[PDB]
Amino acid sequence: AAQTNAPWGLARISSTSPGTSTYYYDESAGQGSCVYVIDTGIEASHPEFEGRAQMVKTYYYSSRDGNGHGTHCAGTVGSRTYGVAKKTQLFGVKVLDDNGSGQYSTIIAGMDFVASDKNNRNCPKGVVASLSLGGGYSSSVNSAAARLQSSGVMVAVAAGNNNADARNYSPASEPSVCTVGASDRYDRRSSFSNYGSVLDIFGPGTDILSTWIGGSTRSISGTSMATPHVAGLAAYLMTLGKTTAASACRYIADTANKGDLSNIPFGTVNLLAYNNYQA
């Protein structure tokens, strides 16, 4: 299949060079897989989700997404127009309030919940978790992410928007998970993106068009936007049976476009997520 006039991020993730506008992908579209979006929630009623999204847990007075950050990320995972895995199942875990903030005790609880809840769900192709959040270093938050990954869940986390080494940010600094950096439409490192040895892969994270609350859309930037590209790619590859949750991040790195990115500090991987689709 192909999506003409697709957002640049999707087209980039299916091409070996920048500047294209079509998104080539196998029509399986991650069907059978599940992606947990641990964020500010999801506007499950958005027409772009086609009823494939639903809230499963909130730690606040409502499960409604009053911020839009979570909805934006969920859309890059598998919305009809702006998603990587257009046929995946989306589950929303609300660990951040409508101001995009939340305590580490809540975020940890949210991750333990996904490790157990997946046993109630029908996900024969695998389970993915997308965490577009993070803060200061914390071994407990790192430990929770490692537990989630260990439980058989492909965990993807944002590297942070500090233009610094991700070693001082959690759960980004947890080596056992997949830490995603951000790049712009010209194969340059996003000026805000963090770097470091702990980074595993880069993704489109500058000027990313996706769904927003109110049945609308808008373009924002951040490693929060690059992580869902990788999460959706994982669910996509896992449906095709090319990798597993335990080795997905490694498979994406071995099949990535290498050397295309610029402004990559020495010691940081120069890898760009890529589906390697052939008709």
Answer for the pair 205, 221: CB distance below 8 angstroms, yes or no: yes
Long-range own/partner contacts, residues 15-18 (CB < 8 A, 24 or more apart): 16/257, 16/274, 17/260, 18/185, 18/186, 18/187, 18/260
Rounded to a whole number of angstroms, the minimum distance from the CB of residue 111 to Cl ion is 8
Rounded to a whole number of angstroms, the minimum distance from the CB of residue 230 to Ca ion is 11
CA dist., res. 206 & res. 203, Å (int): 9
By CB under 5 A, the count of residues binding Ca ion is 2
From Ca ion, Cl ion, none, which one binds at residue 143 (CB under 5 to 8 Å depending on kind)?
A: Cl ion
Task: Examine residue 174 and tell whether it contacts Ca ion (CB under 5 A).
Answer: no
- The residue annotated as part of the active site, out of 33, 72, 224, 229, is 224
Give the nearer residue to Cl ion in terms of CB position, either 142 or 257. Answer: 142
Residue 69 annotated among the catalytic residues of the structure: yes
Kindly report the backbone phi and psi dihedral angles of residue 165, in degrees, each rounded to the nearest multiple of 5, phi listed first: -75, 130
From Ca ion, Cl ion, none, which one binds at residue 200 (CB under 5 to 8 Å depending on kind)?
A: Ca ion
Give the nearer residue to Cl ion in terms of CB position, either 140 or 216. Answer: 140
Residue 229 annotated among the catalytic residues of the structure: no
232, 261, 157, 101: CA torsion to nearest 10: -110
Name which of 62, 59, 88 is nearest 75 in CA terms: 88
Structure tokens at 176: 């056992």
154-to-19, 85, 254 alpha-carbon distances in Å = 30, 15, 16
Residue 254 annotated among the catalytic residues of the structure: no
Segment near Ca ion (CB under 5 A); pick from 61-69, 132-140, 168-176, 264-272: 168-176
Name which of 33, 48, 35, 8 is nearest 212 in CA terms: 48
Residue 81 assigned ligand-binding role: no
Residue 47 assigned ligand-binding role: no
Answer for the pair 13, 69: CB distance below 8 angstroms, yes or no: no
Give the nearer residue to Cl ion in terms of CB position, either 36 or 49. Answer: 36
Rounded to a whole number of angstroms, the minimum distance from the CB of residue 99 to Ca ion is 30
Interaction with Cl ion in 124-163: which residues (CB under 5 A)? 140, 143-144
Peptide bond into 171 cis (omega under 30): yes
Give the nearer residue to Cl ion in terms of CB position, either 45 or 140. Answer: 140
- The residue annotated as part of the active site, out of 69, 72, 184, 221, is 69
> 20, exposed or middle or buried, with CB in 10 Å at 0-12, 13-18, 19+?
middle
Which residue has the CB atom at the shortest distance from Ca ion?
A: 200
Length of the chain in terms of residues written:
279
Q: What track of x and - describes contact with Ca ion for positions 182 through 221 (by CB under 5 A)?
A: ------------------x---------------------
Pick out the residues of the known binding site.
Answer: 16, 175, 177, 200, 260
Q: Name the site residues for Ca ion (rule: CB under 5 A).
A: 175, 200
Pick out the residues of the known binding site for Ca(2+).
Answer: 16, 175, 177, 200, 260
Catalytic residue numbers, as ranges: 39, 69, 224
Q: Name the site residues for Cl ion (rule: CB under 5 A).
A: 140, 143-144
